[PDB]
Paper text:
pmcα-synuclein (αSyn) is an intrinsically disordered protein that aggregates and forms amyloid in Parkinson’s disease, multiple system atrophy, and dementia with Lewy bodies. The amino acid sequence of αSyn can be divided into the N-terminal positively charged region (residues 1 to 60), the highly amyloidogenic non-amyloid-β component (NAC) (residues 61 to 95), and the C-terminal highly acidic region (residues 96 to 140). Here, six residues at the N terminus of αSyn are identified as regulators of amyloid formation. In accordance with this role, the first ~100 residues of αSyn bind to membranes, and alteration to the sequence of the N-terminal region can impact this interaction.
Accordingly, a deletion variant lacking residues 2 to 7 was generated, named here αSynΔN7 (note that Met1 is the initiating residue and hence was maintained in the construct). The results showed that under the conditions used, αSynΔN7 forms amyloid-like fibrils with similar yield (85 ± 4% and 87 ± 5% for αSynΔN7 and αSynWT, respectively), but at a slower rate than αSynWT, with T50 values (time to reach 50% of the maximum ThT signal) of 23.0 ± 2.5 h and 7.2 ± 0.3 h, and lag times (Tlag) of 18.6 ± 2.4 h and 5.8 ± 0.3 h, for αSynΔN7 and αSynWT, respectively. Whether deletion of residues 2 to 7 alters the architecture of the fibrils formed in the same buffer used for the ThT experiments was determined using cryo-EM. After 2D classification, a subset of twisted segments displaying a regular ~75 nm cross-over distance could be identified. A structure could be determined from these twisted segments to a resolution of 2.5 Å. The αSynΔN7 fibril core was modeled from residues 42 to 92 arranged in two identical protofilaments with an extensive, buried interprotofilament interface involving residues 50 to 58. This arrangement is consistent with those obtained previously with αSynWT and C-terminal truncations of recombinant αSyn. By contrast with these longer deletions, the structure determined here for αSynΔN7 suggests that while deletion of residues 2 to 7 slows assembly, the fibrils that result adopt an αSynWT-like fold. Hence, despite differing only by the presence of residues 2 to 7, αSynWT and αSynΔN7 are unable to coassemble into amyloid. Surprisingly, and in marked contrast to the behavior of αSynWT, αSynΔN7 does not form ThT-positive amyloid fibrils at any of the lipid concentrations studied, despite binding to DMPS liposomes with similar affinity to αSynWT and forming similar helical structure in the bound state.
Residue numbers in the entry:
A (entry chain J), B (entry chain L), C (entry chain H), D (entry chain F), E (entry chain D), F (entry chain B), ...: 42 to 92
């Protein structure tokens, strides 16, 4: 029995001349998440979560 | 028995001359999530969730 | 039994002439997460989470 | 039984002429996380988390 | 039984003419984490976490 | 039984003409962590954590 | 005056589980040409030409 | 005056589990050309040409 | 005046579990050319050419 | 005046578990050319050419 | 006037568990050429050429 | 006037568990050429050439 969970593979990306500006005064800001994998057996699991 | 859960593969992207601007004064802002996979056995699981 | 959890592989990326600016006055800012894998047996697990 | 958890492999990246500027006055800022793997048997586990 | 946890391998990176500037007045700033692996049997485990 | 935990291997990097500037007035700044592995049986374990 | 001739850029490709078989007994066979650029000021110029 | 001729840049490719078989008894076989650039001021110029 | 000819840069590739078999009895076989640049002022210039 | 000819730079490659077999009985076989640059002022110039 | 010809730089490669077998009975076999640069003012110049 | 010809620099390579076997009965076999630079003012110049 082969089981795969939270697997990311074979990703090819090319970014050229990309400009990003973030200004924060309060609270939380989350950005630019790429090729992220996570497995949580128990408990709350969050990815790129801003509260 | 082969089981796949929360699997992302074979993604090819090309971004050229893309401009992004974020201004935050309060609260939460979430942006730019790509190729993200997550498995949660128990508990609340959220992806790119802003509260 | 072969089990894979939270696995990232075969990622090729090319970034050319990318400009990023972050200004923070309060709170929390999270950015630029790439090829991150995590497994948590118990307890809350978060990736790129800003509170 | 072969078990893989929180494994990252086969990552090739090329960054040319990339400029990053971070200005912090309060709070916490997290950025530029690449090829990071972590396994936590018990307790809260967080990656690139800014509070 | 072969078990792998928190393993990073086969990473090739090339950085040419990259400029980074960080200005800190308070709080905590974390940046530039690459090819980091950690296993924690018990207790909270965090990677590149700024509080 | 062969068990690997917190293992990093086969990393080849080339940095040419990279400029980094850090100015700190308070708090803590952490940067430039590469090829770091740690195993903690008990107690909190943190890598590149700025408080 | 900015002049570009025979320029290829921003190509991202992902090939997974592709099988190719070529059997040749005479003549010429040409295949699998990708991201090829050529400029010839004088004389015959051919790309992936089988005679 | 900035002139570019026969220039290839920003190519990201990922090949996984690709099988190629070539059997030759006579003549010429050419295959698998990637990211090739050539400039010929005078004379015949050919790329991946089988005669 | 900045002139670029036959220039290849910013190439990131990842090959995993690729199998290649070549059997030759006569003639010429050419394969697996990557990131090759050539400039010829005079005379015939050929890349990966099998006669 | 800055002139670049036959220049290759910023190449990052990762090959894992790749198998290659070549059997030759006559003629010529050429394979596995990577990151090769050549400039010929006069005379025929060939790269990975099998006759 | 800064002139660059046949220059290769910033190459990072990682090869793990790669197997190569070559059997030759006649003729010529050329393989495994990496990071090779050559400049010929006059006369024929060839790289990885099998006749 | 700064002139660079046939220059190779900034090469980092890691080879782990690589197996190579060559069997020769006649002719010539050339393999495993790395970080080789040559300049020939006059006369034929060849690198890794098998006749």
């Amino acid at each position: 029995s082969k089981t795969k969970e939270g697997v990311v593979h074979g990703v090819a990306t090319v970014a050229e001349k990309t400009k990003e500006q973030v200004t924060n005064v309060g609270g939380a800001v989350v950005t630019g998440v790429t090729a992220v994998a996570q497995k949580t057996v128990e408990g709350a699991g969050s990815i790129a979560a801003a509260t």
